[PDB]
């Protein structure tokens, strides 16, 4: 993993030593090279996980997240290099440094073999996304939204830390494979219940679970485009990866402690999809859609079925890609109209035919069109949930109906209809953002073609 | 569509509107032309024999009773013209009425594809600038300092002047653009 | 009532400028400035059949024989109908006929 970590680290001297007229080009090209280098972790011919060193390893679950991060970083630079043209050179290089630092720390997070190292890199990723959302946000309440995000994550993560040193004291090493082999069955006491809740609530906060999800919509409204990408495409999936890694040492009491959070996730995805029906803000609507999809991910991981693990893994990758793509479309419209109101621009299918095609393809990915990995993950979560209890199919049906409804309502009110003819400031298209849209959709097509790469731990 | 509605509808306007709507629902019920002509003559006779009313309070009462009768006897699915609102072909070509300002955003290659049209377009834009300044002055002069104000607009009151706010009427897209 | 003289004079000016705009919407004769037929049976229906049908037939028939029949259970079919009095091509026996049909009314 060091052969991916070191040149990503060396991207920072590249950023700070490049010419001002060559910085974006150099960093984008070399970060694409970083993604191509990170593609070598898919060489998995056998079940022995690629333990490269005593502190770094690759896994059928960890590899798609690392590849997704390394692929998203050049796309992040592409999306963020248009709203920073009227800005200082040192601040542009600082923003590029923040994105590169996030990408580095996320690779080490997903490749860490130690849960303490995972927590350290967890807060290490918590810091610069706060800096991005607070410094480069647009209107006033970016600060207060960042305060919610930071302190939800911290109040979640602190009992996780306490449970981590307690588990280290009880076992001895806290290494993931050693815990996986010498897993001990808990005797189901209230102290064990509190230990379970302590090591679960951090990932429950940063998924986000329903009721504690208040930080996410205003954060995605208030963040820049790269911030929206980093949260909605990597950080929730980091929470779910941490949940999967920590859930192995929590047998047997997770079978009854999983009861309230499954219900919370099912009702949460239904009510957040209803909010997406009755929502006047595009970015917050995409944020609540992300809340619903991550509620599905919670439901799968908590019912703790091998189909549920596969469906969670594909929903992770597919939702990250399609949520970044949806946020890119919303950002392109936002830089056109200098507004985030969903109803202000209506007839964009007229002026932007290709961008409306990208809009339609993104929404079709969002509403789980077959044979895409979106519906593959959603259907396998549905099958595992029906295996867990036959009555979950009603909640699934309501969620799927409202999901298709808000996606097609998005398309109808943002592309179709009469054009607002008063909108003189409609530039035709940027080759940069169209390239970004293609670089979002084409990996979805490739992963639809070969869904075996994002199966996960189980099968 | 080309005339703004007033503050209130007069009694004569309401009677004429009810007469036209009743005749439309009459032909929707009657279908056949001779039957429609007969019953339209009957309805015209009814309106004529209630026309010469002097009380005007009984005339408003008759209008209310006629509206109640019309709402009771109206066709559930009346005939609607294809271009009328609620029609089959209404708003069909709104996907093709592209506004004129994308021609500014056209590329110089597509500029060179249509040279004479774009020269005429530049001439129209220059005329628009000069007429806009003059008509801003005219509309500032014409507005009453206080009192009642309607949505109608004044015309050009001297030679070489264009009427104020003429651009979105003159340069509106064609109803059959393709 | 009819048109007020303010709107009556305005509309004729808006209509007059509308004819000028629609006349300018016309195209000059040079617009736009852009930068072996045989018969239908002999030519038009011939090259299409040998290019869009015959060439994809070769690629499909290459796939369905050397990449499908080489796989175990790709192309599986139901057994054909075997009636009395038939002869098996593969094995070679004759299926014995039926009984005497005691009823011959119709």
């Amino acid at each position: 993993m060091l052969k991916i970590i070191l040149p990503s680290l060396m991207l920072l001297p590249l950023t700070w030593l490049s010419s001002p007229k060559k910085t974006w080009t150099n960093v984008t090209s070399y970060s694409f090279l970083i993604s191509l280098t990170s593609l070598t972790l898919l060489w998995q011919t056998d079940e022995n996980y690629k333990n490269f060193s005593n502190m770094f390893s690759s896994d059928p679950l960890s590899t798609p997240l690392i590849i997704l991060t390394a692929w998203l970083l050049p796309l992040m630079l592409m999306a963020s290099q248009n709203h920073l043209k009227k800005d200082n050179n040192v601040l542009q290089k600082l923003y590029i440094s923040m994105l590169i630092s996030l990408q580095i720390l996320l690779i080490m997070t997903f490749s860490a073999t130690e849960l303490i190292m995972f927590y350290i890199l967890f807060e290490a990723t918590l810091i610069p996304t706060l800096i991005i959302i607070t410094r480069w946000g647009n209107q006033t309440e970016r600060l207060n939204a960042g305060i919610y995000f930071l302190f939800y994550t911290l109040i979640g993560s602190i009992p996780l830390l306490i449970a981590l040193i307690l588990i280290q004291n009880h076992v001895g090493t806290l290494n993931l494979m050693i815990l996986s082999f010498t897993t001990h069955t808990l005797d189901a006491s209230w102290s064990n219940n509190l230990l379970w809740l302590a090591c679960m609530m951090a990932f429950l906060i940063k998924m986000p679970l329903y009721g504690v999800h208040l930080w996410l919509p205003k954060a995605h409204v208030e963040a820049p485009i790269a911030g929206s990408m980093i949260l909605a495409a990597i950080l929730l999936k980091l929470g779910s990866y941490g949940m999967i890694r920590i859930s192995i040492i929590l047998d047997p009491l997770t079978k009854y402690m999983a009861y309230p959070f499954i219900l919370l996730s099912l009702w949460g995805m239904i009510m957040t999809s209803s909010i997406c029906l009755r929502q006047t803000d595009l970015k917050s609507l995409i944020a609540y859609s992300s809340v619903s999809h991550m509620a599905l991910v919670i439901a799968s991981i908590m019912i703790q079925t091998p189909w549920s693990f596969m469906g969670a893994t594909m929903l992770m990758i597919a939702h990250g890609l399609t949520s970044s793509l949806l946020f890119c479309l919303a950002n392109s419209n936002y830089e056109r109209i200098h507004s985030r109101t969903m109803i202000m621009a209506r007839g964009l299918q007229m002026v932007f035919p290709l961008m409306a095609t990208w809009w339609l393809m993104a929404s079709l990915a969002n509403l789980a069109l077959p044979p895409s990995i979106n519906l593959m993950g959603e259907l396998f979560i549905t099958m595992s949930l029906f295996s867990w209890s036959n009555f979950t199919i009603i909640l699934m049906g309501i969620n799927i109906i409202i999901t298709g409804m808000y996606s097609m309502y998005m398309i109808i009110t943002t592309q179709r209809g009469k054009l607002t003819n008063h909108m003189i400031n409609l530039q035709p298209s940027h080759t940069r953002e169209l390239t970004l849209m293609a670089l979002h959709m084409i990996p979805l097509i490739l992963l639809t073609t070969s869904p075996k790469l994002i199966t996960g731990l189980t099968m | 569509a080309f005339c703004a509605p007033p503050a209130y509808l007069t009694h004569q306007q309401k009677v004429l509107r009810l007469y036209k709507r009743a005749l439309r629902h009459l032909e929707s019920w009657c279908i056949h032309r001779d039957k429609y002509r007969y019953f339209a003559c009957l309805m015209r006779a009814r309106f004529e024999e209630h026309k010469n009313e002097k009380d005007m309070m009984r005339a408003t009462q008759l209008l209310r009773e006629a509206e109640e009768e019309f709402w009771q006897n109206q066709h559930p699915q009346p005939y609607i013209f294809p271009d009328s609102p609620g029609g089959t072909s209404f708003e069909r070509y709104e996907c093709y009425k592209v506004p004129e300002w994308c021609l500014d955003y056209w590329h110089p290659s597509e500029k060179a594809m249509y040279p004479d049209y774009f020269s005429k377009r530049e001439q129209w834009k220059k005329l628009r600038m000069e007429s806009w300044d003059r008509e801003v002055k005219q509309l500032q002069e014409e507005t009453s300092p206080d009192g009642i104000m309607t949505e109608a607009l004044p015309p050009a009151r001297r030679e070489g002047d264009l009427p104020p706010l003429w651009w979105h009427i003159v340069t509106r897209p064609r109803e059959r653009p393709t | 009532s009819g048109y007020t003289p303010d709107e009556k004079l305005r509309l004729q000016q808006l209509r007059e400028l509308r004819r000028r705009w629609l006349k300018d919407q016309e195209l000059s004769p040079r617009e736009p400035v852009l930068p072996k037929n045989m018969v239908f049976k002999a030519y038009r229906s011939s090259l299409f059949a040998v290019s869009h049908v015959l060439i994809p037939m070769w690629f499909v028939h290459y796939y369905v024989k050397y990449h499908m029949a080489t796989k175990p259970y790709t192309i599986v079919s139901s057994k054909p109908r075997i009636f009395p009095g038939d002869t098996i091509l593969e094995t070679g026996e004759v299926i014995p006929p039926m009984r005497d049909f005691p009823d011959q009314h119709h």
Partner: peptide
């Protein structure tokens, strides 16, 4: 004849 100019967005990009 009577060809009329059709209004289209900038599809060049």
């Amino acid at each position: 004849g009577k060809r009329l100019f059709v209004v289209k967005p900038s599809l060049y990009y």
